[PDB]
Structure formats: structure tokens, C-alpha cells
Amino acid sequence: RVKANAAKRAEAKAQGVAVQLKRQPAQPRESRIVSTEGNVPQTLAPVPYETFI
Amino acid sequence: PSRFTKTRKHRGHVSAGKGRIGKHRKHPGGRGMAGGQHHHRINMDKYHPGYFGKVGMRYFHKQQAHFWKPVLNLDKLWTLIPEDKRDQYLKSASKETAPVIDTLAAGYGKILGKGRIPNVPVIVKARFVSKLAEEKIRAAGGVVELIA
Amino acid sequence: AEQVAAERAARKAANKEKRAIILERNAAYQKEYETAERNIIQAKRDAKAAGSYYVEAQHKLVFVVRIKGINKIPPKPRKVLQLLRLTRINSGTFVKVTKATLELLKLIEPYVAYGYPSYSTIRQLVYKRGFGKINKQRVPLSDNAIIEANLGKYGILSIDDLIHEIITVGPHFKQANNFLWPFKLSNPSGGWGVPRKFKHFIQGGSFGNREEFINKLVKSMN
Amino acid sequence: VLKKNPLKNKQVLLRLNPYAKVFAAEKLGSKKAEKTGTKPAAVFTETLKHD
Amino acid sequence: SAQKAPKWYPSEDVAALKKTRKAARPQKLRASLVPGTVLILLAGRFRGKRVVYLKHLEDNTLLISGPFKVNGVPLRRVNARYVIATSTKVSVEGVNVEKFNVEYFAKEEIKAERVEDQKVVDKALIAEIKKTPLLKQYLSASFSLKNGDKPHMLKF
Amino acid sequence: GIDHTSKQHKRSGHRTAPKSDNVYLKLLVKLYTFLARRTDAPFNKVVLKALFLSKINRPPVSVSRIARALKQEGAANKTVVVVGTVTDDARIFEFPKTTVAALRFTAGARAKIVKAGGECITLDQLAVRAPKGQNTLILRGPRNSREAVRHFGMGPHKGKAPRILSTGRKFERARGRRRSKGFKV
RNA sequence: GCCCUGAAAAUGGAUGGCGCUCAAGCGUGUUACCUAUACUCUACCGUCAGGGUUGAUAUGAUGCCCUGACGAGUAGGCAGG
RNA sequence: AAAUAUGUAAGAAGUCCUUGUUACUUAAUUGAACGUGGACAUUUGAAUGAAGAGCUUUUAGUGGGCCAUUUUUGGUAAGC
RNA sequence: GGAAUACUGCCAGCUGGGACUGAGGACUGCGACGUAAGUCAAGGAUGCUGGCAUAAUGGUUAUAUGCCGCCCGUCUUGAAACACGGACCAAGGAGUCUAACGUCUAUGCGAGUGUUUGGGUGUAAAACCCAUACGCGUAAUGAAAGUGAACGUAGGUUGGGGCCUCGCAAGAGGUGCACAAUCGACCGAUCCUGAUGUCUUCGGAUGGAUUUGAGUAAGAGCAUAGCUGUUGGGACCCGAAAG
RNA sequence: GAAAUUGUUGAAAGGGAAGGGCAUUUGAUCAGACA
Ligand SMILES: [Mg+2]
Ligand SMILES: [Mg+2]
Ligand SMILES: [Mg+2]
Ligand SMILES: [Mg+2]
Ligand SMILES: [Mg+2]
Ligand SMILES: [Mg+2]
Ligand SMILES: [Mg+2]
Ligand SMILES: [Mg+2]
Ligand SMILES: [Mg+2]
Ligand SMILES: [Mg+2]
Ligand SMILES: [Mg+2]
Ligand SMILES: [Mg+2]
Ligand SMILES: [Mg+2]
Ligand SMILES: [Mg+2]
Ligand SMILES: [Mg+2]
Ligand SMILES: [Mg+2]
Ligand SMILES: [Mg+2]
Ligand SMILES: [Mg+2]
Ligand SMILES: [Mg+2]
Ligand SMILES: [Mg+2]
Ligand SMILES: [Mg+2]
Ligand SMILES: [Mg+2]
Ligand SMILES: [Mg+2]
Ligand SMILES: [Mg+2]
Ligand SMILES: [Mg+2]
Ligand SMILES: [Mg+2]
Ligand SMILES: [Mg+2]
Ligand SMILES: [Mg+2]
Ligand SMILES: [Mg+2]
Ligand SMILES: [Mg+2]
Ligand SMILES: [Mg+2]
Ligand SMILES: [Mg+2]
Ligand SMILES: [Mg+2]
Ligand SMILES: [Mg+2]
Ligand SMILES: [Mg+2]
Ligand SMILES: [Mg+2]
Ligand SMILES: [Mg+2]
Ligand SMILES: [Mg+2]
Ligand SMILES: [Mg+2]
Ligand SMILES: [Mg+2]
Ligand SMILES: [Mg+2]
Ligand SMILES: [Mg+2]
Ligand SMILES: [Mg+2]
Ligand SMILES: [Mg+2]
Ligand SMILES: [Mg+2]
Ligand SMILES: [Mg+2]
Ligand SMILES: [Mg+2]
Ligand SMILES: [Mg+2]
Ligand SMILES: [Mg+2]
Ligand SMILES: [Mg+2]
Ligand SMILES: [Mg+2]
Ligand SMILES: [Mg+2]
Ligand SMILES: [Mg+2]
Ligand SMILES: [Mg+2]
Ligand SMILES: [Mg+2]
Ligand SMILES: [Mg+2]
Ligand SMILES: [Mg+2]
Ligand SMILES: [Mg+2]
Ligand SMILES: [Mg+2]
Ligand SMILES: [Mg+2]
Ligand SMILES: [Mg+2]
Ligand SMILES: [Mg+2]
Ligand SMILES: [Mg+2]
Ligand SMILES: [Mg+2]
Ligand SMILES: [Mg+2]
Ligand SMILES: [Mg+2]
Ligand SMILES: [Mg+2]
Ligand SMILES: [Mg+2]
Ligand SMILES: [Mg+2]
Ligand SMILES: [Mg+2]
Ligand SMILES: [Mg+2]
């Protein structure tokens, strides 16, 4: 990570900064739009008691 | 004085600061140096290694005096001349007329070499010297004169 | 010696100058907030229109209230409650949600109530029970100069600036949020709504993530 | 020497936050949102009332 | 000495008061209190007496009268919180009242003017009362709570 | 309740006055807390505290330890300050001029310093000549040269010297101190 | 599922007692309400901490002044009285 | 082959360039260890917290314990 | 097709009833309202009115009433215990003094320190003065005979308050006592090496070694006094069977 | 000339102990402050 951190620091500086190279935790998810096309929702229900044996 | 003392402060409490359970009793671990090799050994080794057993030769009827021989280091040495006179000898450091210091007269038995005297010449009268003390004393143009 | 008015001149004009900056800044935020809400609303509406589902971003900010007293508490959750600054019953703090704090929240679910706070309740938390930490010494917010003196360095030179850094989880949420002494809340005024507090919200108890239902609780407590 | 709640106490309400005056002037707390009439795709309704 | 002697005494200088911020503003009365309105007195010398309300004096009190010739109560001050305001009104539009204020009752038997003022105010009121049957009788009978009466229910 | 994270009602641990009853000490302290409250010079803050220190925490500084310090590069014209007493040392023969400000100078110490045409100054005189401690070199003495600390940390393999009254062969030098007698330490 | 049988011990006797039967019982749901030395705000005591203040010509510089937080306790320690 | 528990790491005591010292070590100025000189500052290297952190001396009482959830041995069992 | 309503949420929308508090004591802040003059609810209550001026309010006390409240002391895991002591009251009644000590602190002096065995002197067990010794300290290490502390600016490295220099500042560099860590040098012991030499077996220079010391490396001690702690003493007080 | 303990006088309470806590009624008693 060090050896890499040096690089993107060079790649920034030389260019004209804006780096940000601390690690960060998993962030929560952003919004998103899920389409229904090819994928209408399947409705499930709970299933009755049964024995097999 | 009694007035500043914790026992004035313990008045009214039951156990005088000695505890209710353990109590204050006469001689719990035994008296004095009891227990040394048994229930007090951990304390004795640690804090007092060396304590039990013997080393070395007995000497019957030893007379300290026989071995009286105080040390003085070059360190000092010029201290054995009073200051008024000291400066007179420090400057005009020479043969022909160099100070005689009688280190036995001052009550020393051996001259040792802790460190650095000025280049001034001294005539040093003593019973014993350490090889270094003499070397150093000489490199300033002095001598040791062995007395008794 | 002038100063009489002569340096009361600088001061009053400069103070006047600041309220101006605060005035336009608070106008900005209110536009920022209300188009922020409207967009999400038209998001959902557009997505239905297209035959689709707009799934909101997951919440980035939670607000945690310690619901449990100080006795008989296992070590691991005890430490976490300390680090989240919840060391007495009914006090609360804000928390930026990342994987590394989720797991904190998880370890303390039986002792806390938390959820996603609305603008209204972050605003009324801070206007009412908001206190800075200043050379320790818990100091009430009450004047904007108190804020600018300790958070100015980060932009943030007023009370609604503070709120804004909180609710939008800004680049300086850590300094901003730590600045706020943990909030000391009362017991809920109309009560807890449940017979027994110490089971999960989902089982008719009070502890855990109750999501947006936190606003009703915290308002009743504030 | 006495913490005064804004929220109740217009004096310090306005001392903190000067937007309060125009906020209330223009009502703003009761903003009328633009009436728009977009309608949901059949798909959405169908699966809403699906068993 | 018997006792020693402190090494520090309080100064005996008394501080000025801080500059307090407490404007007196006018007491606005509850809507039911409108001159011409009949009041039930709830306490006092004339407790239970039904009486006509005339003016809101500068010390917040209410100027009322019996009228004296009806029920025995004179032009008089009464406190607005020891009064039940009924819903029945006599018009009070020919009753002078300008004269009557706090100093008029500066404590300082009965002065000929009070005696006289009482009659000038009452003849006008009596003129108006006659316009509604039984009102005089109403005004001359005391109010009292009867078995079963529940003030928090009753309309007055 | 509060789940306290740290001891309550804890005193800071630091002296705040000296334990001494000496008026003149208390006067110097009157002086230096003033200087410390009103000058933002760090020298004054350091000096204030040293005035509070107990005798152990202010070992004597010898006049030869002073001569050394003046041998630092660029330090010869500095005025050395010692918040304690200053002692003499016949082990140095040639002692420089300078100005030493201290709490006490032994007879032989002020002699040596004065014989070289230097100057002994009290701390208040120092205050007046240097309200911000300008051009000043503070020296402290050896604290851990004390005989007491010889014995701190006594225990196996620690090498720290017995609390012992008589010494000689035959005092605490056998079982436990040599390989041939039980074991060694 | 509830109820009933299966169900035997010693002074008279215990859903805490009275008593209760579409309960004042059992299962479940919804409101309201009562009240801890706990929580919120405030005053006052003390403890710890951080500030301010030698400028005389009046009285405590270990003083005075501002501010914040905190307070269970046997054995035991220390402190001020 | 889990879950819970558990070792280490997340930088200035860091990273890179140049090339000095030795009796060690290499076929070898090869290496190894310690260095000189030079280049890059706080998004300098995750989170949260921090009524600060480190350190020294000395000394009291104590050294019969018992209980609850969970794991769990002996015992038919036990308020064992 | 077009509305209404419920539900949930928001308003820096308005407004009524009730309760508790009113700390502070000139001014000083941040504001609000006004064209202004001024005003204000803006860094902690004022205005107006009445009653009494006294046992009225308040304190104390006895009793009554609501609710609550088991004998203390002790040892104990656990005591109100069907564990022990204690009928009652006065008065007595238990960590002390001494020898020698550890740590801490105050004070005097400081490479020293300590007048009080003794002498001198006296307003006579005091106070005042003092010569020679002695004790501890200023050297260590060896069983001992013995030997005995600078390669060097009394060393290098890293951190280091403070000071110094530059800079408006932030910062940069210089110096760095104490203290800490680390690598060396010095003295003794142990082991090895064994020069110039010699009453030919004495002598032991010199350079070394995963060895070793309560050491050196520009001294810190000595004395008096106090709290706490240590050992010997009847040893906090009272108690055997015994010898 | 204390206390334990006792006689008389005066006042009060007392349905198988007494004594105690928070609060107020009632009786008795009393300081202060008003001007
Ligand atoms: Mg003693
Ligand atoms: Mg005494
Ligand atoms: Mg005492
Ligand atoms: Mg005590
Ligand atoms: Mg105590
Ligand atoms: Mg006591
Ligand atoms: Mg105790
Ligand atoms: Mg004790
Ligand atoms: Mg006992
Ligand atoms: Mg022995
Ligand atoms: Mg020496
Ligand atoms: Mg539980
Ligand atoms: Mg957080
Ligand atoms: Mg409510
Ligand atoms: Mg309600
Ligand atoms: Mg309620
Ligand atoms: Mg329940
Ligand atoms: Mg509330
Ligand atoms: Mg349907
Ligand atoms: Mg005003
Ligand atoms: Mg009004
Ligand atoms: Mg009539
Ligand atoms: Mg030494
Ligand atoms: Mg039953
Ligand atoms: Mg029941
Ligand atoms: Mg039920
Ligand atoms: Mg109901
Ligand atoms: Mg309370
Ligand atoms: Mg409080
Ligand atoms: Mg306590
Ligand atoms: Mg772990
Ligand atoms: Mg761990
Ligand atoms: Mg923090
Ligand atoms: Mg801090
Ligand atoms: Mg201990
Ligand atoms: Mg112990
Ligand atoms: Mg022990
Ligand atoms: Mg035991
Ligand atoms: Mg438990
Ligand atoms: Mg007041
Ligand atoms: Mg006041
Ligand atoms: Mg009276
Ligand atoms: Mg009366
Ligand atoms: Mg009586
Ligand atoms: Mg009871
Ligand atoms: Mg017992
Ligand atoms: Mg038992
Ligand atoms: Mg008991
Ligand atoms: Mg029993
Ligand atoms: Mg017994
Ligand atoms: Mg008995
Ligand atoms: Mg007695
Ligand atoms: Mg004399
Ligand atoms: Mg005599
Ligand atoms: Mg003689
Ligand atoms: Mg020897
Ligand atoms: Mg030999
Ligand atoms: Mg090195
Ligand atoms: Mg530097
Ligand atoms: Mg350097
Ligand atoms: Mg050696
Ligand atoms: Mg050896
Ligand atoms: Mg020794
Ligand atoms: Mg020694
Ligand atoms: Mg003893
Ligand atoms: Mg016997
Ligand atoms: Mg016998
Ligand atoms: Mg025998
Ligand atoms: Mg008699
Ligand atoms: Mg009583
Ligand atoms: Mg009472």
C-alpha cells in the first residue's frame, strides 16, 4: 500500500493535486433504480407443514 | 508528638486500622529473623541474596589500623595546599622551587589517579602511589618521594 | 482615547457583516434541503411511471439513545457505549454509519434505541440541548460566536451551519459531531409505548434500529 | 446565566439564525409543491394487487 | 478578648439593583368581559351578588354597580378574577362613567358626591333594565350553587 | 448514574505552592507567578514550578557543571540560572567569568565565581534583568545520583545493591551471590 | 386448548389478604393512568479541574472572581477540623 | 470443520536515491550490520473515543468467600 | 372521471387553562422594533393593591393521625436470629516509650558535615563559646595477597524542557541541563596474551575475551526534626494447660 | 452535690411492649423583625 501510495501521490502532485489516500470503511449504498423488464417480481408464500420419512 | 498521630485519628473505629479479619496479634510469622530458610525465604532471596552460608577466610584478631591507608586522587591533591599559597605555585610552575606536598601529613596513605592536574610541577611525598598517579604526576614535571 | 464608538464601529459593522453571511448561507441550505427532498420524491414517481423501483440510498446518519442504566453490563458492550459517548441513561449522540460503526451499533443493540433522524429533530436537538465542548467545560450554544470560535476553522460559523454538517454528514462530521456534548434527554413525555423496554423494537420492545420511528421517541424526550 | 431556548423565545430565535424572519415572512413552512400528475405503469399496479 | 476578631469584614456598602427588563403592559381582558355585562361576584363583601359591569379601571379592576337601588351594591371596584361573566347584557350606552377612576376610590362615612354619583349612574341603568322583563328581579336575587349544579358544565 | 470512565475527584498530582514555609521563598513565588501569568515567556513558567520542588528534586549544581555548560557552542555569555543551591568544586582549576542567578551559593562557590570576576545574582535580580529569561541557560543537577536510588528496584538479576548496614565478606555475599553457594542472584 | 380423573400426612391457614365466575381466571390485542435515591431543568453544599486578578490610597494572595463536571461504600489509606 | 474467543500489522522509529566503516561474511567492495549526503509533510496513510500521557518511591487491608445466566466434572439427587 | 377524508410527517402558524422557580445586583454582550426619536419579552422579576404588625408567620416541644422503622456490638459466605457479650449509672479503661532502621518531607551547612565524651563560661541542669580526636561521606573491587577510575571538548547515537538565531506569523535551523534508551571507553575480579629486563625465576609492559562487581565517567553528603512503616523490648489491652 | 434509682406535685398518653423517621392538626412555649 505504501509503494502504491507514493505513486498516486506523484501522479497527483505532478498533475495538480487532489489525492485522498486514506482507506475508508464500507460506505452505505447509494440510490439505484431496479428495472422490472424481464424481471417481474415472483410472489412467494410460507409453505405448509410436511413430513418426508 | 502524639497530637499528630494516626492513633488519635483511629479512636472510634473498631479495629484501630488493623483490620477485622486478620486482626492485630502478637507474633504471626514468628519472632525476628525466624523463618529465613522456610516461610520467609522468598523475601530473603531477593532483597537479601548472599545471606546464608560462608565465603572466604576467617582472620582471628584482626586489627584495623594495620590496613589504614586512606586514598586521595590527583583529582584533588592541589587541595592539600592552602589557597593563598596555591595560586603562587600554580603560576611559576617550576623546578628549582616546586611545592612539597606531604600527603601523609594530611592523613593519606595512597595517592591514586582520578584525573588531570595542571602542568605545574609538584613534589609529592607519600607512602604509596598507583602506577598512573605517578605517571601523571611526572608528566607535569613532578616526582613522588616515598616516605614512611 | 477614541474606541468609545470608534472601535464599537468595527465591531458592530463586522458583526453586521457576519449575520449577512449567515443570512445567505441559511437561505442556501433551505433551497438545498427542499430540492433534495423533492428530487427523491420525483425519483420514486418517475420510477413507478417507467415500471421500476427507486431504491433510496441507505441512511448515512443515525441517532443513538442509551435506553439502559449503568448496572450489570458485559465488558464488550460497555466499552462501546463509552466510545460512543453514551455513559448514562437517556443521553444520546449522532453516528456516521459505515461498516466500522455498524458493527459498534450491533454490539449494543440491547442497551440503545436508534434510528434515522429527520431535519426537524436534528434542528430541535441542537437548538434546545446543544452544548459545545470547549477546554472541556460543556458550554451552551445560545450565540453563534461560540460556534465560530471553535468550529470556524472548518467553515461552520453558526448554529445552522452546525446542523448542516450533521445532517448531510459533511467532510467534517467528525470534528463537528465531537464538538457536540452528548445530548442529555428526559424520559419520553408520553412514555415508551410498550410494556417492556428491553426487547427489540420488532418484538414490541424498545431497543434496536426503529428507523424513522426514532423521531417520535426523541421528540418526546427532548 | 440562564439558557434560553430558542424554539420558544423569538428574541434569541432571531439572534441565532437571521433567516428566521424571511422564513416566516414567506411562510415557507407551508410551501405548496408543484402539482404534477405522473401515473404508474400497469406493471406496478398489477403486482401491487397480485396475490 | 473573649473571642478573637475576624481579619476581614464585609463592606456595608449596598449594591445598586441591576437594571431590570420588565415593562408593564396593559391587561387585555377575556372576551366575555364587555361593559353592560352582568357578573356574579364569587368572593367578598358582596359575594353571590349579580351586578352590572361598567368600566375597566387603570389599575386593572372592574368598575361595577348593583345598581344600588336594586340589590344594595354601589359603584365599586371588583377584581376580574373573582367574577363570573354571564351572557346577559344591558346596553350601557347612556351611562357616563368618564369620571370614575383609581383616585375616585383613593381611601384617604359617605361623601355626598358618591351618594350623588350613584344615583346618576343608576337611573340610566334602571332605564335600560326595565326593557327586559324579570331582569330586575334577576339582579336582586343572589346566585348560589344548588345541589347537583356542576360549574364545569353550566353555562352562565 | 454515570458509568465513569476514570477516577472522580482526582488531584492533579503536581505541587501548586512549595511545601516550604520560608517567607522569602514565598515572595519569589509571588514574583514569578505574576511573571508567568503576564509574560507568555516559557522560562518564567519553568522557574515557577522549580521553586515548588522538594530538596531531592533540586540536587545541587556544581560550579564545574556550570563551567561545562558555558562551553557549549554559543553559550559563553549566557547567564546560567539554577533554581537551587550551587556548590564549589576544586576539581576545576580554571573557571570562566559569567553571571549565575541562583537560590543559594555556598561560600566557596560564590568565592570561586567572584574570584573570576563573574557575578552571583538572586532570582529576583535575575527577573529584573531578564523579565522573559532572555539569554538564560537553566541547569539542573543529578537527581539519580542520590544514595537512595541505588536500592530502588532490588530483586534477582537487577543489580541494585542490598539495603545493608555493615558491609564486608560475610555480609550478604554467599548463598545466592555466587555459583558455588546455591546459585547466583 | 381449557377443564376433570390420575392427586396420601401430621397445631388452624393462605393466588400476600379480602374476595372474584360474559372475572377481579386463562391466551392475545389496544389505549389511558399510578410511582424510584434513576432521567430532564433549577437553587444550595462540598470535591476536582480550567481561567482571571498585586496597582496604590482599607480589611482575608493559604485570598478574591468567573466557568464546567462530578458525589454509593466495609477492610483500609490520606485530608481538613 | 465452524460461531465465540486469540497473535501481528494499518508509517517520520516511514519510504526512495547516492555511497562510507569492519577484524564478520563473500569467488569477489560480494553481503551483513551501523552510518554520511539527498528527495517527499499532515487525507502522513482506516474507524470511534481520549476530565491527557508517561514514570518513581513507599506503605494499609486482604490472602475462609458466596450467588445468577451460559459452558461444565463427580453424584440417583441435593438449598451437594 | 373528479373530489373529499383517514393515516403518517412538517411549519422559524396563531392561541387558551394549570403548576413549580425568580439564582444574579451599576454599566459593559449578542440582538429585536422603528424613517427617526426612541423602544423591547434581547447576559436570571418587576409593577400595582391589600391584611397583620403580632404568637399572625416561624422555631421548639408534647400528643394525635397517614405511611414507614426488627437490638446493638461481634466473628461470618450469610445475624433480628432458636449464635456470643450486654439489668442500670458514674468514674477508670487499650498502638506507648526506647535502641537501630526504610521511604517521603522541612531546615541548616555542603565535598563536606556533626558545638553538648570533654573544656571554657554563666543571671547555673538553661543560654553562650571551643581545642584534639571520632563518626558518617568524599573509591572501588577480590576469599585473599593485592591492585585501583579521561583515546576522546569526560565519547558516539535517538528523544529531550528551556534558551539562542531567522521569520509579521506558521515555521525552520543552532544549542541542548535533568531524565530515558542504546552502543563504547575507564577501575577491580576471572580468563588469555607474555614486550623491554632478570640475584633463571623473578618481573608483568601490551593488546584482548557470549565472563564478573553494591564501581568511574566535572562529587551529594552530614545533621536535627516530623508523619508512616521495620526489628528487639511486658510492646495495643486483658487470657492458658504448664516449667 | 452529677447519673442510675426514688417520693410528692403539675401536665399528658396508654384495646398484647416501648422507643424512632418524613409530614401536618392541636396544646404549651419562645427568638427575631417591624417602626
Ligand atoms: Mg515517634
Ligand atoms: Mg502532642
Ligand atoms: Mg488531632
Ligand atoms: Mg480515618
Ligand atoms: Mg474517615
Ligand atoms: Mg473518629
Ligand atoms: Mg473504616
Ligand atoms: Mg493500618
Ligand atoms: Mg476486632
Ligand atoms: Mg547468617
Ligand atoms: Mg575523589
Ligand atoms: Mg438482563
Ligand atoms: Mg460516532
Ligand atoms: Mg405530548
Ligand atoms: Mg397526551
Ligand atoms: Mg402523563
Ligand atoms: Mg409488566
Ligand atoms: Mg420533555
Ligand atoms: Mg387488494
Ligand atoms: Mg426595559
Ligand atoms: Mg394581555
Ligand atoms: Mg332588594
Ligand atoms: Mg557514589
Ligand atoms: Mg389459590
Ligand atoms: Mg390481587
Ligand atoms: Mg387479560
Ligand atoms: Mg381510560
Ligand atoms: Mg433527589
Ligand atoms: Mg443536576
Ligand atoms: Mg463518599
Ligand atoms: Mg481482537
Ligand atoms: Mg484484543
Ligand atoms: Mg476526539
Ligand atoms: Mg485533555
Ligand atoms: Mg502493597
Ligand atoms: Mg500486600
Ligand atoms: Mg500479604
Ligand atoms: Mg484468614
Ligand atoms: Mg446476575
Ligand atoms: Mg432576584
Ligand atoms: Mg436576587
Ligand atoms: Mg414577639
Ligand atoms: Mg392576629
Ligand atoms: Mg406534657
Ligand atoms: Mg412495618
Ligand atoms: Mg463474635
Ligand atoms: Mg457458619
Ligand atoms: Mg448483628
Ligand atoms: Mg433461627
Ligand atoms: Mg465466640
Ligand atoms: Mg447474655
Ligand atoms: Mg470516662
Ligand atoms: Mg550570662
Ligand atoms: Mg547546676
Ligand atoms: Mg586538649
Ligand atoms: Mg581492600
Ligand atoms: Mg602480584
Ligand atoms: Mg551508532
Ligand atoms: Mg530544534
Ligand atoms: Mg545535535
Ligand atoms: Mg575491566
Ligand atoms: Mg569474579
Ligand atoms: Mg559498597
Ligand atoms: Mg558505601
Ligand atoms: Mg508489634
Ligand atoms: Mg500460668
Ligand atoms: Mg503457675
Ligand atoms: Mg519443658
Ligand atoms: Mg452537702
Ligand atoms: Mg418524637
Ligand atoms: Mg414534628
From Swiss-Prot, chain A:
Component of the ribosome, a large ribonucleoprotein complex responsible for the synthesis of proteins in the cell. The small ribosomal subunit (SSU) binds messenger RNAs (mRNAs) and translates the encoded message by selecting cognate aminoacyl-transfer RNA (tRNA) molecules. The large subunit (LSU) contains the ribosomal catalytic site termed the peptidyl transferase center (PTC), which catalyzes the formation of peptide bonds, thereby polymerizing the amino acids delivered by tRNAs into a polypeptide chain. This is Large ribosomal subunit protein eL21A. Transmembrane segments: none annotated. Component of the large ribosomal subunit (LSU). Mature yeast ribosomes consist of a small (40S) and a large (60S) subunit. The 40S small subunit contains 1 molecule of ribosomal RNA (18S rRNA) and 33 different proteins (encoded by 57 genes). The large 60S subunit contains 3 rRNA molecules (25S, 5.8S and 5S rRNA) and 46 different proteins (encoded by 81 genes). There are 2 genes for eL21 in yeast. It comes from the Eukaryota. Signal peptide: none annotated. It is found in: Cytoplasm. The chain holds residues 108 to 160 of 160 of the full protein. Belongs to the eukaryotic ribosomal protein eL21 family.
Curated annotation (Swiss-Prot), chain C:
One of its GO terms (cellular component) is cytosolic large ribosomal subunit. Its main location: cytoplasm. GO terms for biological process: cytoplasmic translation; maturation of LSU-rRNA; maturation of LSU-rRNA from tricistronic rRNA transcript (SSU-rRNA, 5.8S rRNA, LSU-rRNA); ribosomal large subunit biogenesis. Pfam families: Ribosomal_L30, Ribosomal_L30_N. It is found in: Cytoplasm. Keywords: Cytoplasm, Ribonucleoprotein, Ribosomal protein. Belongs to the universal ribosomal protein uL30 family. Present with 101000 molecules/cell in log phase SD medium. There are 2 genes for uL30 in yeast. This is Large ribosomal subunit protein uL30A. It comes from Saccharomyces cerevisiae (strain ATCC 204508 / S288c) (Baker's yeast). The gene is RPL7A.
From Swiss-Prot, chain D:
It is found in: Cytoplasm; Nucleus. It comes from the Eukaryota. N-terminally acetylated by acetyltransferase NatA. Transmembrane segments: none annotated. There are 2 genes for uL4 in yeast. Component of the ribosome, a large ribonucleoprotein complex responsible for the synthesis of proteins in the cell. The small ribosomal subunit (SSU) binds messenger RNAs (mRNAs) and translates the encoded message by selecting cognate aminoacyl-transfer RNA (tRNA) molecules. The large subunit (LSU) contains the ribosomal catalytic site termed the peptidyl transferase center (PTC), which catalyzes the formation of peptide bonds, thereby polymerizing the amino acids delivered by tRNAs into a polypeptide chain. Belongs to the universal ribosomal protein uL4 family. The eukaryote-specific C-terminal extension harbors a nuclear import signal and delivers the ACL4-uL4/RPL4 complex to the pre-ribosome, triggering uL4 release from ACL4 and incorporation into the 60S ribosomal subunit. This is Large ribosomal subunit protein uL4A. It comes from Saccharomyces cerevisiae (strain ATCC 204508 / S288c) (Baker's yeast). The gene is RPL4A. The chain holds residues 312 to 362 of 362 of the full protein.
From Swiss-Prot, chain E:
The modification N-acetylserine is found at residue 1. The modification Phosphoserine is found at residue 11. InterPro entries: 60S_ribosomal_eL6, Rib_uL2_dom2, Ribosomal_eL6_CS, Ribosomal_eL6_KOW, Translation_prot_SH3-like_sf. Keywords: Acetylation, Cytoplasm, Isopeptide bond, Phosphoprotein, Ribonucleoprotein, Ribosomal protein, Ubl conjugation. GO terms for cellular component: cytosol; cytosolic large ribosomal subunit. It is found in: Cytoplasm. GO terms for molecular function: RNA binding; structural constituent of ribosome. It comes from the Eukaryota. The keyword Nucleotidyltransferase does not apply. Coiled coil: none annotated. One of its GO terms (biological process) is ribosomal large subunit assembly. CDD domains: KOW_RPL6. N-terminally acetylated by acetyltransferase NatA. Component of the large ribosomal subunit (LSU). Mature yeast ribosomes consist of a small (40S) and a large (60S) subunit. The 40S small subunit contains 1 molecule of ribosomal RNA (18S rRNA) and 33 different proteins (encoded by 57 genes). The large 60S subunit contains 3 rRNA molecules (25S, 5.8S and 5S rRNA) and 46 different proteins (encoded by 81 genes). Present with 37100 molecules/cell in log phase SD medium. There are 2 genes for eL6 in yeast. Belongs to the eukaryotic ribosomal protein eL6 family. This is Large ribosomal subunit protein eL6A. It comes from Saccharomyces cerevisiae (strain ATCC 204508 / S288c).
